[PDB]
């Protein structure tokens, strides 16, 4: 089975524009976009772990990779989202 992110993109779509559907061509574009940014971030997180002789990728590595890869305002809001997520998950 070819696992895909399609159901999750569809859930997200129905929270910003509840009237709108999406064609399979656009769904396949989104499905490629997710894989691309996943690979880039995991790449830089790996390098940052290796250079400091640490064995481990933690939340600090992902934060630093995000600040390196995304433009500044996107990095700010991404960090705010990840911080809120990890804080509320820790509070659980």
């Amino acid at each position: 089975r070819k696992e895909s992110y399609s159901i999750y993109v569809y859930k997200v779509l129905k929270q910003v524009h509840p009237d709108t559907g999406i064609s399979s061509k656009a769904m396949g574009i989104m499905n490629s976009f997710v894989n691309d940014i996943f690979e880039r971030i995991a790449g830089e997180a790996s390098r940052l772990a290796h250079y400091n002789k640490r064995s481990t990728i933690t939340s600090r590595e992902i934060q630093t990779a995000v600040r390196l890869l995304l433009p500044g305002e996107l990095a700010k809001h991404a960090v705010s989202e990840g911080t809120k997520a990890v804080t509320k998950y820790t509070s659980a």
Partner: protein, 108 residues
């Protein structure tokens, strides 16, 4: 044994924390993976998805259509002055171009 409550529902996310943690471990990025990596990554991927779709739906509404198609995603990505930087090398099939005529070409 407690009734399961998926980690996405502890984080308050729709993206699959389980799958993204699996893919972090299996992808040979590093020999150990901490529990704070996948929640953060899935949160950022959700953020970027919703970011793109919010502009694409506006383009779709101006087309007076109920459906998003690649033309509208091209409009969204190329109109945002920062998403154009992240995806500057990417080319989208069936996307076409933004209307663009240099002022010198038009008549007086």
């Amino acid at each position: 044994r407690a009734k399961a409550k998926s980690r996405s529902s502890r984080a308050g996310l729709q993206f699959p924390v389980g799958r993204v943690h699996r893919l972090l471990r299996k992808g040979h990025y590093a020999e150990r993976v901490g529990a704070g990596a996948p929640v953060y990554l899935a949160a950022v991927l959700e953020y970027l998805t919703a970011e793109i779709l919010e502009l694409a739906g506006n383009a779709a509404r101006d087309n007076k259509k109920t459906r998003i198609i690649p033309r509208h995603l091209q409009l969204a990505i190329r109109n945002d002055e920062e998403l154009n930087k992240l995806l500057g090398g990417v080319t989208i099939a069936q996307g076409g171009v933004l209307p663009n005529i240099q002022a010198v070409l038009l008549p007086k």
